[PDB]
């Protein structure tokens, strides 16, 4: 089983450094390079830099320079990556990759290591209800919705009906408003079902401890 | 940096069908030892990137029968053949034949079917935000294909910019459609100081916008 494994996801506030792992196992460790790469949202796959592990040179793409250090210890068979005085842009998945000698490809990839810099602290969400609003079904069926607001970190886990109503139902993702977060779901059901039937919408919140049942009622 | 670029951004493409991603180079992508370092990745969804074809033509180890490199100089070219439902991912190029590697945008492969327009709804404040000062209106764009959809917010006869959020759902596997929704946020005062509030929908198959409205 020939990997790379790298450390958890890591949730940390600016200034603050963070030591990034990348253990080998399975592979002649000296003769590949580690090459480092960061894939921030809604950006493209950036190379960070790289160690080649006989010279014990990294060498950085001065894109990053002076915060990121690349660091590893050798007969531990572990690569590593230190990004000092974090800032918020750094929010993204560091991959750490194998790189070859002959071919110059990355062929072993480890699997990520998301950091989310951020100045939040621990937000429950408030859950609000949204139903028709009086409007009057265009064709045979009802939508309501739940609207999560406000919460820090992720995830949040929304389902309606403690997991009754699974198709209709769509929980978009989370989006910021100032260092918290937003999210929403919709269920669509007959409208024999709401108000008849009950329609309840449970966010989970487990970073606070937090569980919220809405059921949504008319309007 | 070389500048890689790909396109289509996405790829409709029913099951079956061939497929090309043509990805392009800003600079040449011959080395001096004479070869060409272009590489190809597929990222399948919530994952980290798995390598399928290496100088420009040659096929990793066992990475499908189906796929062709093609190119040379800035212009390469990968073609699926019969698409299978597990080649479905971003496609990325690289070059590393100039220091920095760099890479290219991203091809999404996506199923086709038919259009569907939008079941469209909007949902006034809720009371119970209202009565902490605020009044998100929200809107759904739910079951629609293809993914553009441009939503205009009409908050009062004129059209507002500030405080809406949008956030699309991927493609739906079950119907191989999408969703969108937009949030326009105002404080609870500023809600109630006004009159009708329309999320308005623009999209393919529609002659003239499929548009809601509420007003107080
Ligand atoms: C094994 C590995 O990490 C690979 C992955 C991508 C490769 C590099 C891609 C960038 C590159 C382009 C070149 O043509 C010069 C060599 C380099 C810089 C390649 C290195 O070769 C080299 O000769 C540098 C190694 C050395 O001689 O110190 C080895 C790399 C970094």
């Known amino acids: 089983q020939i990997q790379l494994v790298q450390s958890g996801p890591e949730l940390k506030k600016p200034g603050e450094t963070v030591k990034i792992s990348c253990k080998a196992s399975?592979?002649?460790?000296?003769?590949?390079?580690v090459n480092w790469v960061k894939e921030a949202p809604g950006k493209e796959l950036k190379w960070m830099g790289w160690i080649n592990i006989y010279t014990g040179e990294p060498t950085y793409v001065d894109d990053f320079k002076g915060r990121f250090a690349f660091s590893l210890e050798t007969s531990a068979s572990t690569a590593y990556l230190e990004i000092n005085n974090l800032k918020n842009e750094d929010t993204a998945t560091y991959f750490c990759?194998?790189?070859?000698?002959?071919?110059?490809?990355?062929?072993?990839w480890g699997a990520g290591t998301t950091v989310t810099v951020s100045s939040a602290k621990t937000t429950p969400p408030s859950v609000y209800p949204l139903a028709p609003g009086s409007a009057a079904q265009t064709n045979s069926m009802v939508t309501l919705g739940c609207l999560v607001k406000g919460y820090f970190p992720e995830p949040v886990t929304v389902t309606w009906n403690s997991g009754s109503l699974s198709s209709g139902v769509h929980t978009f993702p989370a989006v910021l408003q100032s260092d918290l977060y937003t999210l929403s779901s919709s269920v669509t059901v007959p409208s024999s079902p709401r108000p008849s039937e009950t329609v309840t919408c449970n966010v989970a919140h487990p970073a606070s401890s937090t569980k919220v049942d809405k059921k949504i009622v008319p309007r | 940096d070389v500048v890689m670029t790909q396109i289509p951004l996405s790829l409709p493409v029913n099951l079956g069908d061939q497929a090309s991603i043509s990805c392009r180079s800003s600079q040449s992508l011959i080395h001096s030892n004479g070869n060409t370092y272009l590489h190809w990745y597929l990222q399948k969804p919530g994952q980290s990137p798995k390598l399928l074809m290496y100088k420009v033509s040659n096929r990793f180890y066992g990475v499908p029968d189906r796929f062709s490199g093609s190119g040379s100089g800035t212009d390469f070219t990968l073609k699926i053949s019969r698409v299978e439902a597990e080649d479905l991912g971003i496609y990325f190029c690289s070059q590393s034949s100039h220091v920095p590697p760099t890479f290219g945008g991203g091809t999404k492969l996506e199923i086709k079917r038919a259009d569907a327009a939008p079941t469209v709804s909007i949902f006034p404040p809720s009371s119970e935000q209202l009565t902490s000062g605020g009044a998100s209106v929200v809107c759904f764009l739910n079951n629609f294909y293809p993914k553009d959809i441009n939503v205009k917010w009409k908050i009062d006869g004129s059209e507002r910019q500030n405080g809406v959020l949008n956030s699309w759902t991927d493609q739906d596997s079950k119907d191989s459609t999408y969703s969108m929704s937009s949030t326009l946020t105002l404080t609870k005062d500023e809600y109630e100081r006004h009159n009708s509030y329309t999320c308005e929908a623009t999209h393919k198959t529609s002659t003239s916008p499929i548009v809601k409205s509420f007003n107080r």
């Open positions: 990759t194998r790189g070859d000698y002959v071919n110059w490809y990355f062929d072993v």
């Open positions: 399975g592979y002649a460790f000296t003769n590949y390079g």
